[PDB]
Design a protein around this motif. Structure first.
Motif, PDB file in Angstrom:
ATOM      1  N   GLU B  10      -1.601  11.078  -2.827  1.00 43.98           N
ATOM      2  CA  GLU B  10      -2.477  11.103  -1.663  1.00 43.98           C
ATOM      3  C   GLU B  10      -3.921  10.799  -2.032  1.00 43.98           C
ATOM      4  N   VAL B  11      -4.356  11.206  -3.221  1.00 40.73           N
ATOM      5  CA  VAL B  11      -5.729  10.946  -3.629  1.00 40.73           C
ATOM      6  C   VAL B  11      -5.932   9.485  -4.018  1.00 40.73           C
ATOM      7  N   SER B  12      -4.915   8.841  -4.591  1.00 41.07           N
ATOM      8  CA  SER B  12      -5.054   7.505  -5.152  1.00 41.07           C
ATOM      9  C   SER B  12      -4.279   6.453  -4.368  1.00 41.07           C
ATOM     10  N   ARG B  13      -3.851   6.776  -3.150  1.00 36.03           N
ATOM     11  CA  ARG B  13      -3.111   5.815  -2.345  1.00 36.03           C
ATOM     12  C   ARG B  13      -4.004   4.707  -1.812  1.00 36.03           C
ATOM     13  N   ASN B  14      -5.319   4.899  -1.836  1.00 34.64           N
ATOM     14  CA  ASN B  14      -6.265   3.958  -1.252  1.00 34.64           C
ATOM     15  C   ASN B  14      -7.049   3.165  -2.283  1.00 34.64           C
ATOM     16  N   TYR B  15      -7.483   3.790  -3.374  1.00 34.20           N
ATOM     17  CA  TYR B  15      -8.220   3.063  -4.399  1.00 34.20           C
ATOM     18  C   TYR B  15      -8.079   3.775  -5.732  1.00 34.20           C
ATOM     19  N   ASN B  16      -7.787   3.007  -6.778  1.00 32.56           N
ATOM     20  CA  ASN B  16      -7.814   3.506  -8.144  1.00 32.56           C
ATOM     21  C   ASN B  16      -8.179   2.358  -9.072  1.00 32.56           C
ATOM     22  N   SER B  17      -8.600   2.706 -10.288  1.00 22.71           N
ATOM     23  CA  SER B  17      -9.110   1.697 -11.207  1.00 22.71           C
ATOM     24  C   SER B  17      -8.023   0.781 -11.747  1.00 22.71           C
ATOM     25  N   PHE B  18      -6.756   1.057 -11.457  1.00 22.86           N
ATOM     26  CA  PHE B  18      -5.655   0.210 -11.887  1.00 22.86           C
ATOM     27  C   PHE B  18      -5.236  -0.794 -10.825  1.00 22.86           C
ATOM     28  N   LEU B  19      -5.949  -0.860  -9.710  1.00 23.71           N
ATOM     29  CA  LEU B  19      -5.521  -1.635  -8.558  1.00 23.71           C
ATOM     30  C   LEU B  19      -6.226  -2.984  -8.550  1.00 23.71           C
ATOM     31  N   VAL B  20      -5.512  -4.013  -8.097  1.00 22.65           N
ATOM     32  CA  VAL B  20      -6.042  -5.368  -7.976  1.00 22.65           C
ATOM     33  C   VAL B  20      -5.650  -5.864  -6.592  1.00 22.65           C
ATOM     34  N   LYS B  21      -6.597  -5.847  -5.661  1.00 20.95           N
ATOM     35  CA  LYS B  21      -6.341  -6.200  -4.272  1.00 20.95           C
ATOM     36  C   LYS B  21      -7.021  -7.512  -3.926  1.00 20.95           C
ATOM     37  N   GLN B  22      -6.240  -8.455  -3.413  1.00 22.47           N
ATOM     38  CA  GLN B  22      -6.780  -9.653  -2.792  1.00 22.47           C
ATOM     39  C   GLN B  22      -5.760 -10.137  -1.771  1.00 22.47           C
ATOM     40  N   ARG B  23      -6.124 -11.184  -1.038  1.00 17.18           N
ATOM     41  CA  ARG B  23      -5.262 -11.672   0.027  1.00 17.18           C
ATOM     42  C   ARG B  23      -3.906 -12.083  -0.533  1.00 17.18           C
ATOM     43  N   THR B  24      -2.876 -11.961   0.308  1.00 17.23           N
ATOM     44  CA  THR B  24      -1.486 -12.246  -0.065  1.00 17.23           C
ATOM     45  C   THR B  24      -0.981 -11.291  -1.146  1.00 17.23           C
ATOM     46  N   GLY B  25      -1.106  -9.996  -0.884  1.00 15.43           N
ATOM     47  CA  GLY B  25      -0.436  -9.001  -1.691  1.00 15.43           C
ATOM     48  C   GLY B  25      -1.369  -8.301  -2.666  1.00 15.43           C
ATOM     49  N   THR B  26      -0.938  -7.121  -3.109  1.00 10.03           N
ATOM     50  CA  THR B  26      -1.700  -6.289  -4.027  1.00 10.03           C
ATOM     51  C   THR B  26      -0.843  -5.963  -5.241  1.00 10.03           C
ATOM     52  N   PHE B  27      -1.493  -5.856  -6.398  1.00 10.93           N
ATOM     53  CA  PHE B  27      -0.804  -5.637  -7.659  1.00 10.93           C
ATOM     54  C   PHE B  27      -1.436  -4.454  -8.381  1.00 10.93           C
ATOM     55  N   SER B  28      -0.765  -3.986  -9.431  1.00  6.59           N
ATOM     56  CA  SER B  28      -1.261  -2.868 -10.225  1.00  6.59           C
ATOM     57  C   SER B  28      -1.086  -3.171 -11.703  1.00  6.59           C
ATOM     58  N   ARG B  29      -2.146  -2.944 -12.479  1.00 10.83           N
ATOM     59  CA  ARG B  29      -2.139  -3.193 -13.920  1.00 10.83           C
ATOM     60  C   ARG B  29      -1.975  -1.874 -14.672  1.00 10.83           C
ATOM     61  N   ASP B  30      -0.749  -1.361 -14.675  1.00 10.96           N
ATOM     62  CA  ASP B  30      -0.410  -0.152 -15.410  1.00 10.96           C
ATOM     63  C   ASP B  30       0.518  -0.467 -16.572  1.00 10.96           C
ATOM     64  N   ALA B  31       0.479   0.406 -17.576  1.00  9.86           N
ATOM     65  CA  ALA B  31       1.458   0.330 -18.650  1.00  9.86           C
ATOM     66  C   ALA B  31       2.812   0.861 -18.203  1.00  9.86           C
TER      67      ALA B  31
END
Lengths: 124, 141, 183, 148, 52
Positions: B10-31
RNA sequence: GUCCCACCCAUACCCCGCCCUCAGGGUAGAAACGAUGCCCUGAGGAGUAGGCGGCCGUGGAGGUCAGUGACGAAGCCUAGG
RNA sequence: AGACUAAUCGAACCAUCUAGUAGCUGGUUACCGCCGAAGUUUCCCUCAGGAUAGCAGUGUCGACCUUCAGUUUUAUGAGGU
RNA sequence: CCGGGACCGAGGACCGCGCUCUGCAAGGAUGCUGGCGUAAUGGUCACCAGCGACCCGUCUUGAAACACGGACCAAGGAGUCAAGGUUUUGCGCGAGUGUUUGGGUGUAAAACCCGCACGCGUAAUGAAAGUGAACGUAGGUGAGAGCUUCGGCGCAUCAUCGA
RNA sequence: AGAGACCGAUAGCGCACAAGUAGAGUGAUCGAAAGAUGAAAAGCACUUUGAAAAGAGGGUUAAAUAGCACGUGAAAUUGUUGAAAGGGAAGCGCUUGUGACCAGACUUGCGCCCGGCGGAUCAUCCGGUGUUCUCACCGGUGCACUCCGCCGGGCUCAGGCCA
């Protein structure tokens, strides 16, 4: 590598919705603007005039944002970014940023060829 | 208590430092995130039990989380390197995932990520030279 | 054409809380589940009240709950989706078993000193997942200072907006009949 | 914060939401409370009845200190003794002592009586007291003195 | 020069808010998600001897 | 002037595809989910003055991408995508 | 002769009060989506203007209360075109 | 009951209602075959052709008007701020609430701590001297979500008779 | 003297410059426009045409597409070259046609059988370590109808455009 199977792509329009009276004055960019005049022709929808952008022109939700080959564009900046497309070979396609040095450009294309990811703006 | 996996999401559903948001989908750079999507099912850094796969020098290196030592990151990661054969690696990973109830829903995803890394570690094939059509036929002449 | 009087008419009640409390969102998820997969109307009514606003959830007091704890209700469960406050007038507190959204410092202390229990809404769903042996309560909705000004007018006996109270303010004409008329 | 306010949604629409026929001129109607008796009478008579006129006698050089006497009801009287001592009395373990409450110290002057009272004798020291208040404190078993 | 530059907030909310921050400072998943490099540190609440 | 056959076309009526808005449902002894998601069903779409909601751009501030760059950043031209 | 008093006179020129007041003309800057009017009643040295009621938007709450209706039938009254 | 023609092929394991019942025309298209694998299909621009198309902004019952402003281009250009009210949304505490006039301290116009008074609220009504809120389990009647040992108890709120 | 969630040469004081200067009025007074070569002037020697201004060669510099009209150099407006149309306006919307120009996609993939090449090492057991306590890693044994990589031949399935 070809993309996934998908339904045919229909565009519903190709013209660009130019702005009324932009072919007569030079101080008028061609970006569309809503005509809000009292007795304007385009606002009243007379016969034989420019059309207006509605919401009935939208595209199918299954084939939205896909370039005519089948992929979706993804802007990359370095070699760590093209690695996010490891699990998406048949859905997304990379696009090299415009402010990357020439050495970085060739480095990225090597890694992309290994990963099997299509690159669009690849220098000939 | 007042902390849990659901609360952290709930705290990180909106923004976190592992998130990469741009048009046509969002990705996450996690190990610890398979398929690199942004979702509760795949966010590894929030769940109490996750999996991750990283390319080694000759094979793959699989990493998992130890639910007991959660408050000590120095030793909270179970690591094993598979460098023998594709099929044997496939079997070991699938059994590690869906035999004792440790996230039995990531079985299909874990196998697929292993396939991609091994697929890329092969020697590449040379591209065939391009053709020119009408435009440069006149120029070449 | 279709010749209708209404079209694209939205709803009238909230369908989700407008707050962004993380713990409150968890309650909503839990009770969404309960109300979907049960048949007790207690669950559905609790769900709706979780959306309301602070002026639609007035506070209740130990005296008001104590009122409804008579005539054979000394062993039911009181549930109040609101705050619960203390009353400086109730001299002796009975034995209760309350389930509320949040208590005040003194309210919680006095209940547990008489020998009762204070719960939360998650514990309540864990103990009585169908609301058996419970009774729902509300607070006084029309007990705000801002409600005494509604619908002001002649022959209405309402409260006016005046900057001070005394002799010189809105007394001379139209109230007493000795100077002109009366309302 | 001006980045979200209705003036940012009016850009592009001539007249800025104020109407084409009535054009939002400077001061149509007069400044302040003008026209109270002439063209704003309908408002000043649907609301604020009592605005005009004179009533009552006047009072030169009022000193508000002469009129200081805050009150307190009789059901809140027991809330003037600390909690630990209070519970000992109401629970019934003393049986032989009575508290002497001094209203003036706690910032009160008159003791009105509105609620009930438990049957325990007390002693109240006030400046003023009401008739009903006296009866209740007396039938409980106590007395009220005047201290000035 | 007389616009409202400073603002005023309740002391109760100040203390509530700073207490919440200390509590979140002991949750390792939040440390990573905010951008720190703590993939080595032995325990997530560190306490040095204080002799050092 | 009266009567009788066939034929022509509106953004109107019928059938089908697609977009949006509104309404009604299903989805955890979780092999689970940008639960603000996904799946199933039905109806509707004109508009000045005016009201509300969602999104896109500009100059600055805090945090983060261990972001780009003299092997060329910003800017400007371009019936090239 | 209301003539002349630095091309200015039925009350010179210069700076300040001064961003003097206006019920009166002129203008008022990106996109999409949903809803969608009035020129009428009463009062004002009111008639190119205001307050008041009406028409309209948004936010909801009480139930899903089962009540309602610019309509018809049956029974029974009033009217002076 | 037999012919002839046109437009369309949404969905994506089984689950159903059925029939002429080793199967099927039954909850949405499959099978066989040919040419070409590039400027051929497709897209952008310029021009000719068929039909359509009065100059924008504004005041107005009515504007393309023989109603007013506009030769052209680039930059500048118009509902803001303060004090005082009011309703609504989010938050903290709750019969109380509010540290910052001031003091202590400080990595110094930041952050952190402290308390006597004071403001609003807890009690109204009269011009004023003044007086100052329980007969009842804090009342009776008709409705009321919910609960219930099935008899009943009845929150909020609406109407009414009382204290 | 120290600072800023201030402005950045039509902004910020009227003045970032020999600014209360140049200029106007008899006078009280009114009152502007105007920043940037290059790191370093290394600010173009010498020949040649011309009366001269200057031009052409030739030089300095990383660059003269930086030459004292000097960073970058847009639009209105103009010249040359290339393409096209024009019987009292032009521009514009829907749909073909001609001419010019052009982005995509395909150029193989998986699987099976036979032959050849090369390698360490398939199943099983023993010891050690970790872990989700039943699933794995490392060391040894295992030595050719087992496993892996490549090449050659044959075969099934799928894969682009128009019909």
């Amino acid at each position: 590598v070809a993309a996934k199977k998908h339904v045919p792509i229909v565009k519903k329009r190709t013209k660009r919705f130019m702005r009324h009276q932009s072919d007569r004055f030079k101080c008028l960019d061609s970006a569309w603007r809503k005509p809000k005049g009292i007795d304007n022709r385009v606002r009243r929808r007379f016969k034989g005039n420019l059309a207006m952008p509605s919401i009935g022109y939208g595209s199918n939700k299954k084939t939205k944002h896909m370039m005519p080959s089948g992929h979706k564009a993804f802007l990359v900046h370095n070699v760590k970014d093209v690695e996010l497309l490891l699990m998406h070979n048949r859905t997304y396609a990379a696009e090299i940023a415009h402010n990357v040095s020439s050495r970085k450009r060739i480095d990225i294309i090597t890694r992309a060829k290994q990963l099997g990811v299509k690159v669009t703006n690849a220098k000939a | 208590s007042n902390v849990s996996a659901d609360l952290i999401w709930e705290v990180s559903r909106n923004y976190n430092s592992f998130l990469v948001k741009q048009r046509t989908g969002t990705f996450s750079r996690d190990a610890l995130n398979l398929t690199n999507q942004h979702s509760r099912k795949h966010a590894g850094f929030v769940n109490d039990k996750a999996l991750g796969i990283v390319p080694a020098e000759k094979g793959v290196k699989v990493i998992a989380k130890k639910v007991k030592a959660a408050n000590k990151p120095a030793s909270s990661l179970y690591t094993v390197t598979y460098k023998s054969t594709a099929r044997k690696a496939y079997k070991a990973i699938a059994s590690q995932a869906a035999k004792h109830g440790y996230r039995a829903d990531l079985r299909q995803a874990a196998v697929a990520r292993a396939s991609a890394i091994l697929r890329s570690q092969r020697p590449v094939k040379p591209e065939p030279p391009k053709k020119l059509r009408g435009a440069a036929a006149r120029r070449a002449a | 054409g279709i010749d209708l009087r209404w079209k694209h008419v939205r709803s009238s009640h909230r369908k989700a809380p407008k707050s962004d409390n993380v713990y409150l969102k968890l309650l909503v998820k839990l009770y969404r589940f309960l109300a979907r997969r049960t048949e007790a109307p207690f669950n559905k009514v609790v769900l709706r009240r979780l959306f309301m606003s602070r002026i639609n959830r007035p506070p209740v007091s130990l005296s008001r709950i104590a009122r409804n704890l008579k005539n054979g209700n000394e062993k039911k469960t009181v549930v109040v989706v609101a705050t619960v406050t203390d009353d400086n007038r109730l001299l002796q507190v009975p034995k209760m078993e309350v389930a509320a959204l949040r208590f005040t410092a003194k309210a919680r202390a006095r209940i547990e000193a008489a020998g009762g229990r204070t719960l939360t809404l998650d514990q309540l769903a864990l103990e009585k997942p169908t609301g058996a042996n419970t009774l729902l309560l509300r607070g006084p909705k029309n007990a705000r200072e801002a409600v005494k000004h509604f619908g002001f007018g002649p022959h209405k006996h309402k409260k006016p907006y005046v900057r001070s109270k005394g002799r010189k303010f809105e007394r001379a004409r139209g109230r007493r009949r000795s100077r002109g008329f009366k309302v | 914060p001006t980045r979200f306010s209705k003036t940012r949604k009016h850009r592009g629409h001539v007249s800025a939401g104020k109407g084409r026929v009535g054009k939002h001129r400077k001061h149509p109607g007069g400044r302040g409370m003008a026209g109270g008796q002439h063209h704003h009478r309908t408002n000043l008579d649907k609301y604020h009845p009592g605005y005009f006129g004179k009533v009552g006698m006047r009072h030169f050089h009022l000193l508000r200190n002469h009129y200081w006497r805050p009150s307190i009801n009789i059901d809140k009287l027991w809330s003037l003794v600390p909690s630990d001592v209070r519970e000992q009395y109401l629970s019934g373990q003393k049986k032989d002592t009575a508290p002497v409450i001094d209203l003036l110290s706690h910032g009160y002057a008159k003791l009105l009586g509105k609620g009930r009272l438990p049957e325990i004798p007390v002693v109240v020291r006030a400046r003023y007291v009401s008739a009903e208040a006296e009866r209740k404190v007396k039938e409980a078993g106590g007395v009220v003195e005047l201290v000035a | 020069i007389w616009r409202k530059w400073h603002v005023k907030i309740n002391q109760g909310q100040k203390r509530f808010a700073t207490a919440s921050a200390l509590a979140a400072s002991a949750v390792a998943p939040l440390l990573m998600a905010r951008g720190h490099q703590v993939s080595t540190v032995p325990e997530v609440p560190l306490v040095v001897d204080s002799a050092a």
